């Protein structure tokens, strides 16, 4: 996260760290959506142009974390992956269309002050909240600039009008994406960055005071560049696939 700040303790208890076993390193962010399921970006797991193709046994998920590097004894929980599900129409060839994947844990994680699932949006909640100007919140242990944070970083960012998103890039933008960030004139700044991928873009419903994950950190041209915007997988638009995966393999 660039131009963000230290998260508070328990501020984002659905935050998951995707951890490579060997060598031990951070791969990506992710989120906890129930006691057995974790949501992330497909490109964190599968990206053929760079020979990235992770299998279940390659990775661990670390839940309840705050410190980036410390093993947070008695606080974090580490889970093994039973199965990875990548969107069948995840488009790694062109524009990361449908950049989404699910991970089923080998065993349920115990909830706590530091570990708790985020809600997934219904149509009405998406329709109501996904509007230009409305701010959401992004979290991660990724790069601080285009160097790595001691603790989880957080930043709030405004959703951007679809034509401005499109006009900011040469990448073909789909309905399965939205972009967020401040415009150059707006003054304030901030963005996700490398290492933040797969992490959650969340919003707090003013209707029921619940946090909803509207987006997954997907990609950007650099990080925090003027006139550029972070792009996010549109979670509601892909919810039918999420339900299908969870219904079938629950």
């Amino acid at each position: 996260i660039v131009e963000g700040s230290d998260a508070e303790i328990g501020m984002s208890p659905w935050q998951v760290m995707l951890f490579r076993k060997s060598p031990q390193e951070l791969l990506c962010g992710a989120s906890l959506i129930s006691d057995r399921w974790v949501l992330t970006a497909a490109h964190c797991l599968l990206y053929p142009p760079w020979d990235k193709n992770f299998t279940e046994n390659d990775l661990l998920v670390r839940i309840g974390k705050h410190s980036r590097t410390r093993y947070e004894r008695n606080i974090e929980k580490i889970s093994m992956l039973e199965k990875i599900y990548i969107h069948p129409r995840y488009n790694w060839r062109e524009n990361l269309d449908r950049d989404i994947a699910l991970m089923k844990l080998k065993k349920p994680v115990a909830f706590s002050d530091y570990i708790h699932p985020v809600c997934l949006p219904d149509r009405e909640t998406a329709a109501s909240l996904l509007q230009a100007g409305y701010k959401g919140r992004v979290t991660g242990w990724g790069n601080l600039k285009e160097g790595q944070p001691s603790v989880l970083q957080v930043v709030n960012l405004p959703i951007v009008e679809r034509p401005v998103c499109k006009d900011s890039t040469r990448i073909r933008i789909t309905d399965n994406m939205f972009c967020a960030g401040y415009k150059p004139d707006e003054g304030k700044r901030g963005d996700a960055c490398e290492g933040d991928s797969g992490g959650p873009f969340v919003m707090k419903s003013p209707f029921n005071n619940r946090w909803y994950q509207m987006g997954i950190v997907s990609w950007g041209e650099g990080c925090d560049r003027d006139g550029k915007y972070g792009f996010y997988t549109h979670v509601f638009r892909l919810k039918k696939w999420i339900q299908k995966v969870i219904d079938q393999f629950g």
Partner: peptide, 11 residues
């Protein structure tokens, strides 16, 4: 750079 996680999680 990352502190070693317990051995039980690697096995």
């Amino acid at each position: 750079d990352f502190e070693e996680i317990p051995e039980e999680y690697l096995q």
